[PDB]
Paper text:
Of note, three (NIV-11, −12, −35) out of six Y489S−F486S− clones shared the same clonotype (IGHV1-58/IGHJ3 and IGKV3-20/IGKJ1), which is frequently utilized in BA.1/BA.2-neutralizing antibodies from diverse individuals. On the contrary, the class 1 antibodies NIV-10, NIV-11, and NIV-13 recognized the epitope region, including F486 and Y489; however, the conformations of spike in antibody-bound states were different. NIV-11 recognized only the 3-up conformation of RBDs with C3 symmetry, whereas NIV-10 and NIV-13 bound to both up and down RBDs and showed several conformations. The side chain of the F486 residue of the RBD interacted with a hydrophobic pocket at the boundary between the CDR-H and CDR-L loops of NIV-11. Furthermore, the side chain of Y29 in the CDR-H1 of NIV-11 formed a hydrogen bond with the side chain of Y421 of the RBD in a unique interaction that depended on the CDR-H1 sequence of NIV-11. NIV-11 and NIV-13 had similar escape profiles limited to positions 486 and 487, reproducing the reduced binding to F486S and N487G.
SARS-CoV-2 binds the host entry receptor angiotensin-converting enzyme 2 (ACE2) with the spike glycoprotein. Neutralizing antibodies against SARS-CoV-2 spike glycoprotein, primarily the receptor-binding domain (RBD), are essential for COVID-19 prevention and treatment. As the vulnerable sites, we focused on ACE2-binding sites in the receptor-binding domain (namely receptor-binding site, RBS), which have pivotal functions in viral entry into host cells. The structures of the SARS-CoV-2 spike protein complexes with NIV-8, NIV-10, NIV-11, and NIV-13 Fab were determined using cryo-electron microscopy (cryo-EM).
Numbering used by the authors:
A (entry chain A): 348 to 545
B (entry chain L): 1 to 215
C (entry chain H): 1 to 223
The structure:
Amino acid sequence: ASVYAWNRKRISNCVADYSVLYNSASFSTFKCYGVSPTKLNDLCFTNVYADSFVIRGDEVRQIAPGQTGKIADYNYKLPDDFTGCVIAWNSNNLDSKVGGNYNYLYRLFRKSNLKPFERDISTEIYQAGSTPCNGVEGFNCYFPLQSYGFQPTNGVGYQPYRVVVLSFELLHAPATVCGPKKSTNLVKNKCVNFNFNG
Amino acid sequence: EIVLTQSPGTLSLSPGDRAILSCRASQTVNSNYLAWYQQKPGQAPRLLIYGTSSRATGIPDRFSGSGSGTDFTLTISRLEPEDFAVYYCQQYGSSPWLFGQGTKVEIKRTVAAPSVFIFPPSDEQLKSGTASVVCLLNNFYPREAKVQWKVDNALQSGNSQESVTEQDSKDSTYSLSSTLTLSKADYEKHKVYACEVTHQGLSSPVTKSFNRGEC
Amino acid sequence: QLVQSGPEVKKPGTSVKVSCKASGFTFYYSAVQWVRQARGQRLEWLGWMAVGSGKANYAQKFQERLTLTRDMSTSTAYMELSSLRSEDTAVYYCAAPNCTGGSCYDGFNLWGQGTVVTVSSASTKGPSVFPLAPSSKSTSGGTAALGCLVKDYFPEPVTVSWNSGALTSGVHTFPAVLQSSGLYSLSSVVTVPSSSLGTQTYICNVNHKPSNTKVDKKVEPKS
């Protein structure tokens, strides 16, 4: 999805495996705020939210708490106390095509800043001046959205990057979603120290 | 497209009176995309009235815009010496934002007759193979004034370029310079040169004549 | 306030680039329009561009030669005009409104200082000074006129003065005209009483910075 229309997917009632993602050895960025990524398996939450989009390579550092910028103010803003992980990797061969890709758009102007975790799909003509636009684009009346152009020869800084944000939630609930547990083959006829579930 | 025309070309008005300027369009122009700009010789234009009714920041109240549709008017209640400039009207509703031809405002005074001077070529100028003759018109108020160069009772043309100075402040009288840049070969094959001027302030045209025999 | 680049002199069949830098206001929400004017002529509209998205609109005459761009790093707008001709010699202005936030002024109140562009082929050359010696014919009723004629200088800016600047009462300098040879020429005159000649040292000081030539040409009555 585009940055101005970032998609959401809730995940619950299953057994996650964070170590495989940790050791994929293919992602470019992996920052987890407030949680140990190597100890994520030894934790158990109620549900997780996954959000994905494609943005500019040079904008990847606006996806963080306490970030100021056009993306942080008009498209996608994270709360200052956000707990979870941010992942991003290059998509040169998949998203950048000869002639450019115009299927990805980003918002330019907005009347007010964005709170954490909401979307803006409206496309009403912005009113920069003190005169109503009345549906015609011109002086002091600009369209709110334009599109990126992804050319193969572009620099890595302007190369597209795919970004996924995982956010974990905690609430009074069964807290179903969390990682697995390992098991050893049983031994019999000896003094052993056992652990069967609890 | 949209074409804007300012009907009053030039206005010679003494300070104190009321000044009016008119800007007219061929098609209807949006009343929220019209502006008037004031420009002095040698400076960038300054915005005066925007939105067809409201003035800019710091512009004194005396300027007032009015009108809507195909007609627009600018009014100066009382003139002051710093209000003499060129005024342009622009619209920016459609795609081509055409300007207007502009209107020049100058002070008005009494008609002053000009003074005619003739300048012989210098001897060292002869070394260059070209003759330079100058006819000078001094202190004539009306901008309308024409000079014809006459050689051996024949009107030469094509080499009589003119130069007009800016309006003065102490007296506001223009000075004109006409330069006859002639080839030397034409210089030898003739005897009498002259510049004849005709001005509104002169009852009859005045001919200033020069001869190479007294050189 | 808007700051433009310096004046320049180029050759026909080339391309020129002009920069307009903005500061002191929110340049993100503004829009810049370009207006050029010849010497003593009417203003001519070229086009405009919205800085927010880079979209630009051009007049039909300069559709295929004029290109407007921008850079957010320095908050600067750029004109590029290719295949220049002699008539393109003029002064250019960049105009943009004053934006403080989301809201912005409804007019082009802010204007640049202009940039002078000259397109021609004549090379730079120093001027020549010719004294306009007063004579009996020039003298009329006590009043007489005398001065200096400046010829064959290519660059526009030249300066003329009298008595090292001491003589300025009733002095006239005329705007420079363009000859068919591509070299400029002007005249400077001054009025004096007929009794003044032969009593004061009259001399015209002329300067030409591009040629770095400074002359003090003395003028004497014709014999």
